[PDB]
Amino acid sequence: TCPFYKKIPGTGFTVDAFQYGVVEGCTAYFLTHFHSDHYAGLSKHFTFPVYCSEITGNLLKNKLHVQEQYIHPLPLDTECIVNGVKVVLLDANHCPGAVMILFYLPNGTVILHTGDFRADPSMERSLLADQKVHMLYLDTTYCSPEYTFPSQQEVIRFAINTAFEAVTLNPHALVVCGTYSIGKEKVFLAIADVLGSKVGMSQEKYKTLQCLNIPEINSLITTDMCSSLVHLLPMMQINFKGLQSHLKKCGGKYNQILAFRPTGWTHSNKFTRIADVIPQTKGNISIYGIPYSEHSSYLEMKRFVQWLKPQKIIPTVNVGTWKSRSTMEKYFREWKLEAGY
Numbered sequence: 001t002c003p004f005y006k007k008i009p010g011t012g013f014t015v016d017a018f019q020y021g022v023v024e025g026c027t028a029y030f031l032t033h034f035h036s037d038h039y040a041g042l043s044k045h046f047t048f049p050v051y052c053s054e055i056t057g058n059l060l061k062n063k064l065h066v067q068e069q070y071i072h073p074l075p076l077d078t079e080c081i082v083n084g085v086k087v088v089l090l091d092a093n094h095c096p097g098a099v100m101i102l103f104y105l106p107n108g109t110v111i112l113h114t115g116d117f118r119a120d121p122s123m124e125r126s127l128l129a130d131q132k133v134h135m136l137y138l139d140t141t142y143c144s145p146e147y148t149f150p151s152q153q154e155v156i157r158f159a160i161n162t163a164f165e166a167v168t169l170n171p172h173a174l175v176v177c178g179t180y181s182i183g184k185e186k187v188f189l190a191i192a193d194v195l196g197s198k199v200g201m202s203q204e205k206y207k208t209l210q211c212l213n214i215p216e217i218n219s220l221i222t223t224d225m226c227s228s229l230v231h232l233l234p235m236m237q238i239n240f241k242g243l244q245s246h247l248k249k250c251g252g253k254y255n256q257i258l259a260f261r262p263t264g265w266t267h268s269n270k271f272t273r274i275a276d277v278i279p280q281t282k283g284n285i286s287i288y289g290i291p292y293s294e295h296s297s298y299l300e301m302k303r304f305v306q307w308l309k310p311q312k313i314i315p316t317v318n319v320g321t322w323k324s325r326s327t328m329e330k331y332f333r334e335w336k337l338e339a340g341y
């Protein structure tokens, strides 16, 4: 049955709640972003109103074939009325099209649902600064102090400099980047830009990217693999067997692979600086795991919450075990005593 942390009190609304069948009393289903753990259940046969960003609504229509008449895209940073309730969508700094949702309840309560987010000081200057938030439905994916990671900018600098050096030393090396969902597009686009190449990919992944309103995308991506020296493959194929196989298919055009796996976190971060990352190598194949995250680090999350000062926090991730839930609640209390709210 639908869990309570997917339901918005004082409304008929749910958030990211498409796999429970007809939720009793639900008048509007919001979708924060196009990741499968959140959209699971949507299809061309869904006949209730879905509220989302423009980009998410492009992906709904084109990838899942949801009918247009049930897709209700909203502009960002704009006060809108849904079934008599004021709402605002804000940029979540997650994947393309991903939003946070502010709900202004008829009784005066204000609720923020972060969806999935990577907290940033730029959010301290959005429409969130303009009123008090009483309840926060928080993406707690990395809510424990061991989760540190570098900025996205530092990680992309490492990736660009590594690829540029490799291919200038060996003009016959191929660069491969893994993916399994939307998100993290800067990794492969930034490398193709420094190399003077388009990114080559499957027809299905090219279609997905053409839904994202990314400026000058026709200039950076292609389905012609022959004309490209940066290839995108499914994340499952980013291993020595899968890469050796791919290299066979390129017909002697290339004699080396440099591959990137943008993971969220890996425990090499507790010790290792970004400067100190090394690949796994077998033969003429090297694989780099880079810590490119689209979720808040522990410190990023803590700063956002200590700035917002919510009256009540509802975690939406890691809620399945009693030790996880109790540990998160103890961090929330620390933050509140340290900050004075």
Ligand code: NI
Residues within 6 Å of the ligand: 033, 035, 094, 116
């Ligand atoms: Ni997500």
